[PDB]
Design a protein around this ligand. Sequence first.
Ligand SMILES: [Ca+2]
Ligand SMILES: [Ca+2]
Ligand SMILES: [Ca+2]
Ligand SMILES: [Ca+2]
Length: 128
Amino acid sequence: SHMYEYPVFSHVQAGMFSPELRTFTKGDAERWVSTTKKASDSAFWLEVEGNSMTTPTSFPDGMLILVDPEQAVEPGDFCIARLGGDEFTFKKLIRDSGQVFLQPLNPQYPMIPCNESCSVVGKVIASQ
Ligand SMILES: [Ca+2]
Ligand SMILES: [Ca+2]
Ligand SMILES: [Ca+2]
Ligand SMILES: [Ca+2]
């Protein structure tokens, strides 16, 4: 068999009170994390730096999530969604009564619609 290793990209809190909102930092990556998971060449890792995805499946501050911008995302999958055109968020894509929403694993965070100022950047396919 064969193993893979993808770049880990940096990102920081967008707004001042928007821990869920994140923005990619400037600069190349200096960290490459391996995995058994094979993905597209645009695949990369992100470091969970908050607790909005921390449940009572869970992604605590310090966990790495592998993002693949080349795989189709559907309700039930976790993904990185882009909002406002610049910032992005890590949520679970779901269907609440037929409506498409981004859901945080931590109930202390609000759910967001994904319609106009919302597009899907990639599927989460693995974690460390
Ligand atoms: Ca490609
Ligand atoms: Ca942190
Ligand atoms: Ca699928
Ligand atoms: Ca894992």
